[PDB]
């Protein structure tokens, strides 16, 4: 079993009040069954688009989640991943620069 690495980054320069796209890229996991949510202020965002799961040269799986977002200085955004390799869900908050 392999633990998912999680990276969160924005499609365009994050400018407050401008609509944008936030990406959550989950990598290096096995087995492929996995549950990925993106969060605004700690709540599940409803419309989260997902790429088809694929895998790398080393056979580890990867997948890209993405959703529309508008950054402001009153909002946090995160990506929570549940997977058999980890006891509890792992969450990565958006760096705010990325």
């Amino acid at each position: 079993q392999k633990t998912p690495q999680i990276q969160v980054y924005s499609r365009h320069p994050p400018e407050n009040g401008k609509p944008n796209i936030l990406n959550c890229y989950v990598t290096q996991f096995h087995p492929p069954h996995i549950e990925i949510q993106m969060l605004k202020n700690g709540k599940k965002i409803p419309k989260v688009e997902m790429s088809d799961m694929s895998f790398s040269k080393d056979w580890s799986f990867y997948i890209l989640a993405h959703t529309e977002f508008t950054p402001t200085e009153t909002d946090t955004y995160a990506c929570r991943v549940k997977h058999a390799s980890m006891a509890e869900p792992k969450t990565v908050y958006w760096d705010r620069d990325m």
């Binding site: 365009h12 990406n23 096995h30 088809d52």
Partner: protein, 267 residues
Amino acid sequence: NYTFRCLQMSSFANRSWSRTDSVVWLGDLQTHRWSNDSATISFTKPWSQGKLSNQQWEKLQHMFQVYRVSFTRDIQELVKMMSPKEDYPIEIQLSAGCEMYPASESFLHVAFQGKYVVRFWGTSWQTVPGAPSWLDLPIKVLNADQGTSATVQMLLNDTCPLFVRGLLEAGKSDLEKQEKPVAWLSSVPGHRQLVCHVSGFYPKPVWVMWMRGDQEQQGTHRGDFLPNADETWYLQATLDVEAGEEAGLACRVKHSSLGGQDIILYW
């Protein structure tokens, strides 16, 4: 150098549950999706059919339709025969296709529980050094199936290069698309850490460097290439610096799409 990969993922959960899903990639652009849910192979591009006629495509599709059911039956049946020694859950991955050259080489690799165990090479299937010894007998059996060996050899040696040359022609404008990067700077709010962000570029080759005037700052750490959802790439390059030394620094970007007019962001 374009590498065509068909990536098959099979999960077997217990005896009454399994799914097989596939995705196909020409280089870094996804060309096909084949969900367990669907009887047919779906296109993720307008040119996903290559130069194959509607009939020629259906014949190839049928062959893979037959394969998927047969493969599932065979793995289910192997597990019953080996029980309780080999038992659920089981994950099988196949990576198969061909790497084109100015000429091509083909491959078919199989992983079991995340480890590479089996390949097709030449005229036969074979386990690889260090594979579990219980795979040797099932692979010998499979190697007796002459017709399967012959179809696999056709598929690897001939069909794959022929079909990909069809994709390279049919999807030329899409494969040779130029998308421009946008960049922006940030830092961790002791020595600071400057981050130059570069998103939206295609194709993959790119150059990102921190600069002071014309001097490349060789402490520049290049991050991994992260995909965007719109078939463009994301990359960041960071530099660890002392405070007060950030004046006069800049991030310089070069990319094919920019036509020699580099991006320069002064800190």
